[PDB]
Amino acid sequence: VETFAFQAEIAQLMSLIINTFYSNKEIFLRELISNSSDALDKIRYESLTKELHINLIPNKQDRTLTIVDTGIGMTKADLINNLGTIAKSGTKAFMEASMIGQFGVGFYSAYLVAEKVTVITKHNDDEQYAWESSAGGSFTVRTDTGEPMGRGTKVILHLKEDQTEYLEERRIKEIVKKHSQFIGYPITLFVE
Ligand SMILES: CCNC(=O)C1(c2ccc3nc(N)nc(C(=O)N4Cc5ccccc5C4)c3c2)CCC1
């Protein structure tokens, strides 16, 4: 388990997301589905140079909403450096300007609804990694000794006690149909 500090910009952004009163918290899903779509586009665009989909797994017991994709995945180098550089440039752009995704920092909208976010990832020529952050100015990165998932990303949202609506079938179905209705990959909503 390695702990890293977020950079000043990203840290300030997450603080802004968590401490700012904003009721349209449902934007987080569009942002994460979009990110999955790009990762899936990356493994698809690389293929020409197996199954490409997105799964939405709610869990009442653990109080989690998971967004799984079979996209390109991420390396340790992607988790530490790379995501941090993308975010440095992104936060800079989003500050000068709900429109969060246009600046490549839409993932962090997850903190509108999650108290902790766990990111299990696997890239084709690297190991399985687990990224985790409860915001608070830091993130951890470890090698996942957990169940070997296939190439892709698993974004596990540990929902706030008050944000349990994002566990309901009707609600997930309504958000998807509203802002992710033209994604080029099948989106499966798991039941309970
Ligand atoms: C397609 C273009 N992107 C890439 O190549 C990267 C990449 C590749 C696969 C990805 N898969 C998903 N599902 N999501 C993301 C993502 O943008 N984030 C996940 C995450 C976790 C912690 C903190 C911030 C973020 C933002 C991915 C990013 C390589 C580095 C960016």
Q: Cα(121) to centroid of ligand 1, in Å?
A: 9
Q: Cα(34) to centroid of ligand 1, in Å?
A: 10
Give Cα 101 to chain centroid, integer Å. Answer: 12
Domains, the chain, in order of start with CATH, read 1-192 (3.30.565.10)
Indicate left, alpha or beta for 157 from its phi (over 0: left) and psi (-120 to 50: alpha): beta
Q: How far is Cα 30 from Cα 34, in angstroms, rounded to an integer?
A: 6
In ligand 1, which atom is closest to the CA atom of 155? 13
DSSP 8-state code for residue 104: T
Structure tokens at 87: 């975010």
The answer to whether the CB of 60 falls within 8 A of the CB of 135 is: no
Q: How far is Cα 125 from Cα 68, in angstroms, rounded to an integer?
A: 19
- Elucidation technique: X-ray
The answer to whether the CB of 179 falls within 8 A of the CB of 27 is: yes
Q: Is 14 in the pocket of ligand 1 (CB under 6 A)?
A: no
Structure tokens at 128: 């399985």
What's the full length of the chain, in residues? 192
Residue 53 backbone phi and psi in degrees, to 5: -145, 180
DSSP 8-state code for residue 3: E
Q: How far is Cα 161 from Cα 137, in angstroms, rounded to an integer?
A: 21
Q: Is 131 in the pocket of ligand 1 (CB under 6 A)?
A: yes
Structure tokens at 33: 């589905």
